[PDB]
Amino acid sequence: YDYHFEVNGTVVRHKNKGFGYMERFFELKESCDERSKLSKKQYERFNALFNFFEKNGVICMAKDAGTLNTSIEINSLAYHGKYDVMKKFIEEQSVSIEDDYKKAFFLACLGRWEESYDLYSNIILNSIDESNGCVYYLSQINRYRIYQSITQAVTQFNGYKPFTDEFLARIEREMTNFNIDDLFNGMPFEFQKKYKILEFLSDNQFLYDDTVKLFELTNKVGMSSDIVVLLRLYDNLRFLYENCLWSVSFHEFHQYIRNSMSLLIEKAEYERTRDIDELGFFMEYYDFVNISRHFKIDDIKNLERSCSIDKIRFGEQEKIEEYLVGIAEEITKQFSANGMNVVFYTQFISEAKAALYFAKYVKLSEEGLGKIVKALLFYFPERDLDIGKRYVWLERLTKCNELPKSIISIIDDFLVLQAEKHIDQNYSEVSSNGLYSRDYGALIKHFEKNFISKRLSEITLCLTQDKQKQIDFLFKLLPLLSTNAKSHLLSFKSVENINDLMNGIRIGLIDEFTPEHEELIIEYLETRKVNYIVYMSTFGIWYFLEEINNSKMEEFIGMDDQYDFFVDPENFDYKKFIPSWLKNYNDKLLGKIAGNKHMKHHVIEVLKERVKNSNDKRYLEILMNYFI
Amino acid sequence: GEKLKEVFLMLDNNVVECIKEITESSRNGKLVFFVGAGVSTLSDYPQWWRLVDKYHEELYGSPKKGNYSSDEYLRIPQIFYNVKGEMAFDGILKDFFQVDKPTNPIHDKILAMNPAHVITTNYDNLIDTACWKRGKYFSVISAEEDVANATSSRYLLKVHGDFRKGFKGENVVLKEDDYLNYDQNYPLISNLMKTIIATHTIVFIGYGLGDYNINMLLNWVRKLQKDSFHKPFFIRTDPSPIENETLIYYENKGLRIIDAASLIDSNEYDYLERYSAVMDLLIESQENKFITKDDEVIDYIYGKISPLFALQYIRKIDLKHVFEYDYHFEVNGTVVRHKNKGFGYMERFFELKESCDERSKLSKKQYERFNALFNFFEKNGVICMAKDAGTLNTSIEINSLAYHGKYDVMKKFIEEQSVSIEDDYKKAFFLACLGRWEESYDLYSNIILNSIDESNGCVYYLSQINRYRIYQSITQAVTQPFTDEFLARIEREMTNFNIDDLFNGMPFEFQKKYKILEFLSDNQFLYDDTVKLFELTNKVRSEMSEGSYSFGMSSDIVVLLRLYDNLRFLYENCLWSVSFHEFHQYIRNSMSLLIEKAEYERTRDIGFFMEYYDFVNISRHFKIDDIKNLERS
Amino acid sequence: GATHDLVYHSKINTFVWDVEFDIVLELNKCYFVKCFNPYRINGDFAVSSIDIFSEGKRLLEFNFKITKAVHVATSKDVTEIVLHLSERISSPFPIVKEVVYL
């Protein structure tokens, strides 16, 4: 409490009733003539202290301020996700005990919790007397933290097989009643004096003051505390990973970056939407990493929902491309083989799903997009992404990008693989979402509608009758074929279905619309009339959109009031127009109903009635963004 | 698990009394084990006679034929040391004692009783490395210069040396001449051991009643006074049961023998079931499993709650730490079990609540104890188990004149004369609230001067805290009112007040009975509830955008009833920590997110009835600009 | 008697609550999920899409008078309750056991 060290490298005085020793130290920094005046041993001490203060990011007094360029540079292989070089450091032989301490933390990160536990023990056994104390004190803490990760880890893995029961018995009889609250109180006389800043690490909840400052953000908010808070994230986070602390893996730290990044994103959103008079948050690489790792996918969804990431831009996009291609090759090499540390798989798959989900917004190259799309389609494991969820992620990766024909080749390869896997007549096709492989075909038709598949053409040159699933699946993959093989699949022509011409035939096919299906609609509606004196909206919309061509519909007024709402808009009683009926229609319809005036002004009055009376915001958004 | 219970049923009075003394001495933390050779030799550790055997092998050649008495265990090495010298003697010492033998479970059972000190006569590294595997720093004090550099107050006193500093005969006590003039080679270790023995409860384990250390200490305790010391215990694990004349003689010598062979049935070689037999009899005596009488559970509950009859309100997340992690006390009056490996004493207590016939079965003093505990549990808002739930009508009723704003009646209470020290404590808090900070400071001082010895401790501990808090309100208040003489007086009075050691210096009874009253001597203590407010703001803020009109239970009400638990705890026990800014931020942030939260659940359209106490809390713990911004967003 | 789980997702006017249907449209163990993709590419003109399960897709011709509906937890045939939620709501599939919200 002789100074207040603020997070920009600027030091102010507080209660230094003394010489002003740091002020004299900075005077010794700039002045060259003063450094000659000292003695040689204190000159070398001055150089070591100089390297200290330049390294830890404290540059000057607050008297002489200036270009306060603040930038975090985490020099730790565990943070960036470089899992290869970590392994290559582990199997190398160490010639120092401090190299062992890092090596231990690295294979703590890789899910190799047993060998890291033992290496935490050997450092304690072999650096006890006096190195500095720090690689005897911290390694004992890290052994207890990795004990808590193993013990809590096998709690719910059982209630698939993480560790042997002998090791669980050994660490139970070893760490039986470990009290951490007296470890520093039992460190010797030199350690307690020189390192009475290293005692919060032996404390359970220690990251809570910064939380209370986040409330000052959320409460009643030039320069602001925003940047300060962000540079405090970048101070705590940098302190854990660079001194190789295993306290990063617990849930206190995860809640910390969760809450902190949540309120800075919502905060910069809030300052962006202070616009009721007067018509930044640049999101560098480290923020892309922190969102990809310390969130879950549902968190990133909710950051898309409330705050809007349209305004948010992304920089350093080449290293973002390097992190993404690193995730792609790592999930590739982990699932081109039998390699599965179950623990490391769980933590890595959280980072991987979140990273690609949040990699919608960044821009990539062609070969990088090829690598991520290939790893997302082929080598990505099951039970985490289903084939509709893969369409969500891939749809994100292809929405804001113009598809450069190589992704069309890769998705074509995935379609060939799905066609070669629907041969067995037991295939399930999960994607409980409702999205299926027909949508992959629709995506290709959305970007390159003139695409012809070669191997699917050959497969439809070899489907006689025998493989029924493969026929039906390839029928849902209709428009990407060649005409002769197309007719060869159209050996099995449709049935007398109506909306199972849509549900059974989910490939459009109103472009090919037979005249007897007008007649079949006539037959259907006259049976519904003779049974009416004793699905539907789809063809009512089809008559309203004028995709079909028949004037038989006019004599069928009264069977369905939706159908009455779409056949005759002028003679429709808008007094009995049910509102519900407006949330189930998409933009093409809600966007061509506004084209029909007799409909449009009546639904303007009833939507003003429901928005004014109730408090719906679906009807409010339809009242704002499509109609008027 | 059943046989040990049956052994507890078949124990006589005396042994049971001894077990009660031991579990008392552990639960205060005054328990000091005096272990020996026996607890080490079940780790297959090299015993001393084998060393004497190999010494005889290099001394007289051929093996010795028959008996080894006492002094041959000292003389045959001594002869060896005078013939072959230091170095070769160290050689056999290395070759025999460079071992890596594992740790017995009886070292674990010793280290499960929370010992203050551990005294020993071994030469191993078993029990200290067992402590390094644990977290309990016992400063291993083996030599005289280890005493002056002792870094803790929990010792590990190897009173004959260790081979920690080399396998040499200089550092350990092995030969006849070494045990002879011991008290002029190691004068300080014995002073510390006799100090610990005089100030604790010494329990012998691992010895036989012929051991020279035991009879040496018994010579010293016969040199002492009669009523000064405490009679030590002696766990006896011998193959033969103890005889009656050895019993009469050694009980009159000063020990208190608990035998292990006359308590269970065992064999001639099965030591470990007798060590674990009596030692686990101590441990499951701590685990309350032997408590089965209804009278006993009343004794237990009254033993843990009759401290708290002085306080006006007790939080639910403090009563969780009275019965330490045996239940989870949730804020609706419903109690669930968590880690109660025992009788289920609270379940039996609620069975004693509804059943009228059971209340007659108890004794009269425990009937009145039952009525006092009954008034406790109805007052603090804990009504029943979570098995029998029902109409959980929860309502806060703060009975404090400072909360409601009744400033008139406060004054009228202050100028009235008080006839109790607890009326003074309230009276002090009231004129702390009225801005009369000087007279409240002095009345905080007079209670300390005049309730010091033993009222309950609470109106000596809390009033000292409240004096320091009103000092911090005066000192921070004149920063940005009072005469300068009073500022000088409280500056020379409260000059370097450390609050972080006040409870650590409260006596033995206060630290045990009120180890829920130590967060009040801590600066930031209201921060866990803050982290729960983020669970609100997180993904139960994720349901407005989907229109989910759900109608279930949420943590919202729980959070609100946690406001109404902390707030009620401060005002009703008259705590001046309400006036600071941590508490103001607490109700600010908490009410902000509950108002925005109920707004959020209201606008999921694609209650929050606001009673009197919420009107008060908004009017007092906000500023006007806050209430504006609650009108805005 | 399981109203403590009844949610009324009302962008698509459903009642997301885990029942297990027994149908006549004759099968057993049925449960329903629904989409919310209004930006669907070539997948009719509707926002939602039912994906009927029979321990897997049934691969759809559907009228479905409801025959037996049982709650998962207390098993409490909630038949009439489901009928009540069909007596008010004029959308297909009132009880839909999950909603994806694309």
Tokens, residue B318: 């403090």
Q: Tell me the CA distances in angstroms from B219 to A14, A615, B179, B212, B213, one per residue in order.
A: 62, 91, 15, 10, 10
Q: DSSP of A484-523, one letter per residue?
A: HHHHHHTTS---S-STTTTSS--S--SSS--HHHHHHHHH
**Parallel/antiparallel/unpaired status of strands C68-71 and C19-22:** antiparallel
CA gap A129, B164 in Å, rounded: 12
How far is CA B230 from its chain centroid? 22
Q: How far is A438 from chain C (nearest CA, A)?
A: 8
CA gap B590, A117 in Å, rounded: 41
Q: Check if the beta carbon of residue C89 is closer than 8 Å to that of residue C13.
A: yes
Q: Residues near A500 by Cβ (< 8 Å), separated by ≥ 6?
A: C60, C61
Closest to A515 (Cα-Cα) out of A544, A539, A550 = A550
Tokens, residue C62: 């559907």
SS3 state of residue A13: strand
- Name beta bridge partners: B156: B118, B140
Closest to B507 (Cα-Cα) out of B460, B444, B573 = B460
CA gap A261, B258 in Å, rounded: 63
CA gap B333, A463 in Å, rounded: 70
For chain C, say whether A272 makes contact (Cβ under 8 Å). Answer: no
Query: Does residue A29 come out as left (phi exceeding 0), alpha (psi in the -120 to 50 range) or beta?
Result: alpha
| Residue in C closest to B554 by C-alpha | C4
Q: DSSP of B503-570, one letter per residue?
A: GGGS-HHHHHHTTTTTSTTSS----HHHHHHHHHHTTTSSSTTTT----S--HHHHHHHHHHHHHHHH
Q: Tell me the CA distances in angstroms from A222 to A12, A271, C65, one per residue in order.
A: 21, 12, 66
Burial bucket for residue B474 (CB in 10 Å: 0-12, 13-18, 19+): buried
CA gap B522, B499 in Å, rounded: 7
> What's the DSSP call for residue A567?
H
CA gap C40, C47 in Å, rounded: 8
Q: How far is B591 from chain A (nearest CA, A)?
A: 12
For chain A, say whether C60 makes contact (Cβ under 8 Å). Answer: yes
> What's the DSSP call for residue A94?
P
Instruction: Give chain B positions within 8 Å (CB) of C101.
Output: 546
Q: Check if the beta carbon of residue A413 is closer than 8 Å to that of residue A374.
A: no
Alpha helices by DSSP H, A186-311: 189-194, 209-218, 225-242, 251-272, 285-294, 297-305
Instruction: Give chain A positions within 8 Å (CB) of C45.
Output: 538, 541, 545, 585-586, 588-589
**Percent helix / strand / coil, chain B, rounded to 5:** 55, 5, 40
Closest to C11 (Cα-Cα) out of C48, C49, C41, C51 = C48
Catalytic residues of B: 123-124, 160
Return the ∠ at Cα A525 (arms to A522 and A530), rounded to 5°: 120
For chain A, say whether C46 makes contact (Cβ under 8 Å). Answer: yes
CA gap A420, A414 in Å, rounded: 10
CA gap B534, C7 in Å, rounded: 24
Closest to B451 (Cα-Cα) out of B466, B441, B462, B437 = B462
Q: Residues near A362 by Cβ (< 8 Å), separated by ≥ 6?
A: A288, A314, A317, A320, A321, A324
Q: Check if the beta carbon of residue C94 is closer than 8 Å to that of residue C7.
A: no
Q: Check if the beta carbon of residue B126 is closer than 8 Å to that of residue B101.
A: yes
Q: φ and ψ at C21, to 5 degrees?
A: -85, 150
Sign of CA dihedral A121, A97, B166, B216: negative
Resolved by? cryo-EM
Q: Check if the beta carbon of residue B571 is closer than 8 Å to that of residue B399.
A: no
- Name beta bridge partners: B202: B32
Q: φ and ψ at C68, to 5 degrees?
A: -140, 130
CA gap C44, C49 in Å, rounded: 10
Q: Residues near B548 by Cβ (< 8 Å), separated by ≥ 6?
A: B604, C7, C8, C9, C10, C16
Among A503, A541, A545, beta carbon nearest to C60: A503
CA gap B214, B204 in Å, rounded: 9
CA gap B310, A168 in Å, rounded: 46
Alpha helices by DSSP H, B162-314: 176-180, 182-185, 189-198, 212-223, 244-253, 272-286, 294-305
**Element at A620 (helix H, strand E):** helix A618-622
**Parallel/antiparallel/unpaired status of strands B118-120 and A3-5:** unpaired
CA gap B609, B460 in Å, rounded: 41
CA gap B113, B133 in Å, rounded: 16
Residue that has been written with the tokens 């911004």 in this structure: B629
| Residue in C closest to A498 by C-alpha | C61
SS3 state of residue C73: coil
Question: What is the rounded end-to-end Cα distance, in angstroms, of chain A?
Answer: 62
Q: Check if the beta carbon of residue A574 is closer than 8 Å to that of residue A561.
A: no
Q: Tell me the CA distances in angstroms from A466 to A420, A563, B327, B389, B449, one per residue in order.
A: 14, 42, 65, 63, 100
Closest to C32 (Cα-Cα) out of C60, C3, C11 = C60
Q: Tell me the CA distances in angstroms from B476 to A82, A420, B473, B494, B580, one per residue in order.
A: 51, 78, 5, 13, 10
Burial profile A576-602: b = 16 or more Cβ within 10 angstroms, e = fewer:
ebeeebbbbbbeebbebbbeeeebeeb
Among A428, A434, A504, beta carbon nearest to C100: A434
Instruction: Give chain A positions within 8 Å (CB) of C42.
Output: 439, 442, 445-446, 507-508
How far is CA A326 from its chain centroid? 15
| Residue in A closest to B627 by C-alpha | A220
Question: What is the rounded end-to-end Cα distance, in angstroms, of chain C?
Answer: 31
Tokens, residue A94: 């160490």
Q: DSSP of A328-354, one letter per residue?
A: HHHHHHHSSSS---HHHHHHHHHHHHH
Closest to A388 (Cα-Cα) out of A433, A357, A354, A444 = A433
Burial bucket for residue C76 (CB in 10 Å: 0-12, 13-18, 19+): middle
SS3 state of residue C34: strand
Closest to A548 (Cα-Cα) out of A591, A584, A512, A503 = A512
Among B547, B551, B553, beta carbon nearest to C11: B547
R_g (Cα) of chain A, nearest Å: 33
Residue that has been written with the tokens 């098993």 in this structure: C75
Residue that has been written with the tokens 């804990």 in this structure: B382
| Residue in C closest to B605 by C-alpha | C10
Tokens, residue A364: 């990539």
3-state helix/strand/coil string of B571-621: HHCCCHHHHCHHHHHHHHHHHHHHHHHHHHHHCCCCCCCCCHHHHHHHHHH
- Name beta bridge partners: C69: C21
**Parallel/antiparallel/unpaired status of strands C33-34 and B139-141:** unpaired
CA gap B393, B402 in Å, rounded: 26
For chain C, say whether B98 makes contact (Cβ under 8 Å). Answer: no
Q: Tell me the CA distances in angstroms from B633 to A402, B593, B630, one per residue in order.
A: 41, 12, 6
Burial profile B483-516: b = 16 or more Cβ within 10 angstroms, e = fewer:
eeebeeebeeeeeeeeeeebbeebeeebbebbeb
Q: Check if the beta carbon of residue B249 is closer than 8 Å to that of residue B209.
A: no
Closest to C70 (Cα-Cα) out of C25, C28, C21, C7 = C21
For chain C, say whether A130 makes contact (Cβ under 8 Å). Answer: no
Q: Check if the beta carbon of residue B621 is closer than 8 Å to that of residue B584.
A: yes
Q: Tell me the CA distances in angstroms from A17 to A2, A58, A107, A500, B559, one per residue in order.
A: 8, 22, 48, 87, 46
Return the ∠ at Cα A60 (arms to A55 and A64), rounded to 5°: 155
Burial bucket for residue C102 (CB in 10 Å: 0-12, 13-18, 19+): middle
| CB count in 10 Å sphere of residue B371 | 11
> What's the DSSP call for residue C21?
E
Among B527, B585, B589, beta carbon nearest to A208: B527
Question: What is the rounded end-to-end Cα distance, in angstroms, of chain B?
Answer: 62
Count of residues for chain C?
A: 102
Q: φ and ψ at C4, to 5 degrees?
A: -75, 0
Q: Check if the beta carbon of residue B289 is closer than 8 Å to that of residue B341.
A: yes
Q: Tell me the CA distances in angstroms from A2 to B90, B132, C9, one per residue in order.
A: 55, 37, 58
Amino acid sitting at position A608: K
Q: φ and ψ at B560, to 5 degrees?
A: -65, -40
SS3 state of residue C51: coil
Q: Check if the beta carbon of residue A177 is closer than 8 Å to that of residue B134.
A: yes
HSE-CB at A254 with a 13 A cutoff on CA atoms is 14
Give the neighbor-by-neighbor strand order of the sheet with B31-35.
Answer: B139-141, B155-158, B118-120, B31-35, B201-205, B233-236, B256-259
For chain C, say whether A584 makes contact (Cβ under 8 Å). Answer: yes
Tokens, residue A438: 């027909």
CA gap C52, C50 in Å, rounded: 6
Tokens, residue B545: 């955008």
CA gap A596, A565 in Å, rounded: 11
- Name beta bridge partners: B139: B155
Touching chains, B (3+ CB pairs < 8 A) = A, C
Q: Between the CA atoms of B315, B319, B322 and B324, what dihedral angle is there, to the nearest 10 degrees?
A: -130
Q: Check if the beta carbon of residue A285 is closer than 8 Å to that of residue A72.
A: no
Kindly determine whether residue B527 and residue A299, on different chains, have CB atoms separated by under 8 Å: no
Q: Tell me the CA distances in angstroms from A174 to A468, B104, B133, B371, one per residue in order.
A: 61, 12, 5, 46
R_g (Cα) of chain B, nearest Å: 32
Q: Between the CA atoms of B428, B429, B432 and B433, what dihedral angle is there, to the nearest 10 degrees?
A: -140
R_g (Cα) of chain C, nearest Å: 14
Amino acid sitting at position A18: G
Q: Tell me the CA distances in angstroms from A335 to A107, A375, A533, B13, one per residue in order.
A: 20, 10, 63, 68
Burial profile A143-158: b = 16 or more Cβ within 10 angstroms, e = fewer:
bbbbbbbbeebeeeee
SS3 state of residue B139: strand
Residue that has been written with the tokens 């560098």 in this structure: A284
Q: Residues near A413 by Cβ (< 8 Å), separated by ≥ 6?
A: A377, A378
Tokens, residue B354: 């509804």
Closest to B282 (Cα-Cα) out of B114, B446, B163, B124 = B114
Size of interface B-C (CB pairs under 8 A): 26
Alpha helices by DSSP H, B60-169: 72-83, 85-97, 105-110, 126-133, 145-148
Q: Tell me the CA distances in angstroms from B326 to A53, A513, B194, B319, one per residue in order.
A: 50, 73, 38, 10
Residue that has been written with the tokens 């301020």 in this structure: A65
CA gap B547, C99 in Å, rounded: 12
Residue that has been written with the tokens 């994720």 in this structure: B542
Residue that has been written with the tokens 């389609």 in this structure: A377
Tokens, residue B459: 């109106």
Q: Residues near B91 by Cβ (< 8 Å), separated by ≥ 6?
A: none
Q: Between the CA atoms of A267, A270, A272 and A276, what dihedral angle is there, to the nearest 10 degrees?
A: -160
**Parallel/antiparallel/unpaired status of strands B31-35 and C68-71:** unpaired
Kindly determine whether residue B135 and residue A306, on different chains, have CB atoms separated by under 8 Å: no
Q: Check if the beta carbon of residue B255 is closer than 8 Å to that of residue B217.
A: no
| Residue in A closest to C32 by C-alpha | A432
Amino acid sitting at position A611: V
Q: Residues near A70 by Cβ (< 8 Å), separated by ≥ 6?
A: A7, A8, A9, A57, A231
Closest to B87 (Cα-Cα) out of B25, B151, B168 = B168
Count of residues for chain B?
A: 633
Sign of CA dihedral A501, A505, A506, A507: negative
